[PDB]
Amino acid sequence: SGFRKMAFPSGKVEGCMVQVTCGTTTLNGLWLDDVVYCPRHVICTSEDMLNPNYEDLLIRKSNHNFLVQAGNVQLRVIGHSMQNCVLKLKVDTANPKTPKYKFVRIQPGQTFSVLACYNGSPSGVYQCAMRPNFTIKGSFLNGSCGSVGFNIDYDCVSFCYMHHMELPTGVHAGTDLEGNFYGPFVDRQTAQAAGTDTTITVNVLAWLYAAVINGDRWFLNRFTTTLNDFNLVAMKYNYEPLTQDHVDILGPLSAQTGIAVLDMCASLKELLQNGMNGRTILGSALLEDEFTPFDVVRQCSGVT
Amino acid sequence: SGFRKMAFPSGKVEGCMVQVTCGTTTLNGLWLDDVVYCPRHVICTSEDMLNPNYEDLLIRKSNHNFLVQAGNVQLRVIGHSMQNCVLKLKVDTANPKTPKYKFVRIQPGQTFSVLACYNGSPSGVYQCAMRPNFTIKGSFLNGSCGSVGFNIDYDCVSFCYMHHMELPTGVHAGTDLEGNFYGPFVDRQTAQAAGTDTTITVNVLAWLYAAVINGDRWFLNRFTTTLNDFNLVAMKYNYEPLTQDHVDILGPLSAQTGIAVLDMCASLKELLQNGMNGRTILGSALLEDEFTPFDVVRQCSGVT
Ligand SMILES: *CC(=O)N1CCN(Cc2cc(O)cc(Cl)c2)CC1
Numbered sequence: 303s304g305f306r307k308m309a310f311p312s313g314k315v316e317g318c319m320v321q322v323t324c325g326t327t328t329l330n331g332l333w334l335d336d337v338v339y340c341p342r343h344v345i346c347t348s349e350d351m352l353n354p355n356y357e358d359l360l361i362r363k364s365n366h367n368f369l370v371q372a373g374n375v376q377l378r379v380i381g382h383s384m385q386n387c388v389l390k391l392k393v394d395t396a397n398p399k400t401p402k403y404k405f406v407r408i409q410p411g412q413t414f415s416v417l418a419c420y421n422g423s424p425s426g427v428y429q430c431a432m433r434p435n436f437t438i439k440g441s442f443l444n445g446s447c448g449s450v451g452f453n454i455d456y457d458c459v460s461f462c463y464m465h466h467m468e469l470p471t472g473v474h475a476g477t478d479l480e481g482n483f484y485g486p487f488v489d490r491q492t493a494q495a496a497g498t499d500t501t502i503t504v505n506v507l508a509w510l511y512a513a514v515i516n517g518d519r520w521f522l523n524r525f526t527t528t529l530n531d532f533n534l535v536a537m538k539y540n541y542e543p544l545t546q547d548h549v550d551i552l553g554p555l556s557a558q559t560g561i562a563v564l565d566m567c568a569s570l571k572e573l574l575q576n577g578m579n580g581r582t583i584l585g586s587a588l589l590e591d592e593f594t595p596f597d598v599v600r601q602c603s604g605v606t
Numbered sequence: 607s608g609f610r611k612m613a614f615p616s617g618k619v620e621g622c623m624v625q626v627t628c629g630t631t632t633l634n635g636l637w638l639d640d641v642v643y644c645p646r647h648v649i650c651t652s653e654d655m656l657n658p659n660y661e662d663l664l665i666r667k668s669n670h671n672f673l674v675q676a677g678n679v680q681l682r683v684i685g686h687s688m689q690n691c692v693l694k695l696k697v698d699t700a701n702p703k704t705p706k707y708k709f710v711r712i713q714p715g716q717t718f719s720v721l722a723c724y725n726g727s728p729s730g731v732y733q734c735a736m737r738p739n740f741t742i743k744g745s746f747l748n749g750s751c752g753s754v755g756f757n758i759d760y761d762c763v764s765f766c767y768m769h770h771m772e773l774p775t776g777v778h779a780g781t782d783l784e785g786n787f788y789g790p791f792v793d794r795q796t797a798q799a800a801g802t803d804t805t806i807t808v809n810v811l812a813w814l815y816a817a818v819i820n821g822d823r824w825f826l827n828r829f830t831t832t833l834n835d836f837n838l839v840a841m842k843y844n845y846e847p848l849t850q851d852h853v854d855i856l857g858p859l860s861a862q863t864g865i866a867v868l869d870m871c872a873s874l875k876e877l878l879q880n881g882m883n884g885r886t887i888l889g890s891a892l893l894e895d896e897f898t899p900f901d902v903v904r905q906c907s908g909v910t
């Protein structure tokens with residue numbers, strides 16, 4: 303028992319982290335096979351950040367300008383190209399520590415682990431979610447760009463995020479491993495609107511199921527609701543509307559606990575309308591929304 | 607910016623995890639050099655758990671009874687011994703993935719990362735603290751025993767915890783890597799009292815400093831207090847008494863933010879007496895106490 307915000311073991315990703323330097327700029331890269339992936343803003347100076355012409359800036363750069371170091375050994379750059387907002391640096395050596403991997407573009411509401419790195423060296427690992435407004439609430443300082451978000455299925459690492467930017471609001475923006483930003487964000491120092499950060503309803507419900515499984519049951523009530531009645535409450539509190547797909551995905555948790563999805567929705571409705579009244583659920587005084595139904599099942603069953 | 611419950615990169619520890627089987631029991635072991643460390647309750651059957659005579663049970667076990675597997679390869683057991691509540695299985699092969707390591711017995715209030723494992727395979731990593739009542743609030747299912755807690759200083763892994771037990775209250779107990787339990791707990795299926803779980807005052811204050819650094823400043827007030835005045839409030843709310851050593855350890859955070867330790871104590875005093883009033887601090891609606899002053903400095907500076 304016990305329920306924690308748990309990240310994937312980071313070993314398979316640590317072995318892929320390299321340091322990329324271009325001119326006077328240093329950030330992290332991801333070394334998979336004979337390719338190093340990094341944010342294209344590595345070619346920028348602080349002067350050209352208001353509106354950089356990445357194509358024009360990259361013309362002035364040659365293979366020998368990209369200094370790639372894995373630990374204390376230098377990788378030889380034999381090719382370079384820009385794919386959307388990422389640079390792909392072809393090196394002469396395949397990473398011997400390359401795990402089985404995939405590049406995946408996650409859906410808002412899905413979770414992933416982040417291995418925060420600086421100068422190609424890992425500092426820590428934490429679990430987070432792609433918010434409905436396509437931002438992430440991470441922990442990234444200067445030099446952390448190029449740090450990646452990933453998921454692990456048995457032995458396969460699915461890379462889903464690469465860190466590129468911090469908005470003036472302290473939230474984070476970045477791309478998938480094809481260089482496409484999540485959301486409307488651009489790799490430019492400009493006014494960028496982070497939209498309404500809505501709560502991931504299906505994840506909150508999954509976390510309520512995890513709470514019941516691990517003993518916290520104070521919030522269970524004698525009530526039920528309908529999808530349409532619940533969604534009127536969810537709209538009022540900036541929660542994502544709950545769909546039948548969401549009810550279906552909560553099916554295994556409903557089967558395990560014997561608590562119908564709509565009964566759990568009525569518990570959530572009362573929690574939204576009345577608050578926790580000074581009580582806690584799984585050590586939290588607020589409704590947690592960064593655990594998917596898959597995460598709850600995984601943690602409650604012990605999948606390795 | 608941004609502040610997260612961050613665990614150490616787990617790679618150095620993943621490479622040490624093995625599966626240990628004795629008779630019909632399977633749990634995790636830690637392979638360092640030519641020694642495998644695991645909870646001694648691996649020699650127990652469910653029948654002998656109310657009051658096991660570990661010395662008598664171990665007499666019936668020979669080297670060939672301890673099946674140790676690293677991935678899919680079998681380690682040859684050439685020696686076995688019991689040190690307190692851990693078994694040390696001498697193998698014929700030094701772990702090639704042994705990092706630089708130390709065995710340390712942590713103080714209550716200190717934090718560490720846990721690499722939850724099952725059948726010698728890592729499932730996830732999370733950050734936690736040794737509570738003042740010597741328990742940890744982890745996430746451990748059947749088969750997770752032998753999973754370790756550790757800290758990392760640059761390249762050296764300081765192992766501090768080995769998981770052994772779950773109390774009927776859902777909290778966790780275990781030992782250091784010499785086999786000595788933290789707290790009064792015994793590896794026996796008996797009524798074991800988890801004492802008063804007090805809040806780690808110095809950690810809450812460090813987290814308040816992290817909040818100010820990362821923008822959350824609503825809780826700052828026009829007041830100050832004294833150590834003795836603050837401690838009257840801390841006693842009332844089951845907080846650990848704050849000592850001058852604690853004030854000294856918060857010194858670098860006080861220097862960085864320009865907020866004197868006693869002024870931050872008055873902010874904490876008002877938060878204790880009045881609550882958050884429906885507001886949050888670093889995405890939390892309760893006062894967080896599992897970040898040491900060292901953790902805050904590390905995360906706010908980017909130490910790898
Ligand atoms: C994440 C990181 O290491 N960095 C982000 C800040 N710098 C790059 C940058 C600057 C800027 O004004 C806008 C954008 Cl999109 C990126 C340094 C690297």
Ligand SMILES: *CC(=O)N1CCN(Cc2cc(O)cc(Cl)c2)CC1
Pocket residue numbers: 633647655746747748749750751752769770771772792793794795
């Ligand atoms: C953590 C884990 O894998 N296990 C804990 C529960 N079993 C061992 C056990 C049983 C018991 O009644 C008391 C104690 Cl101290 C340990 C299985 C292994």
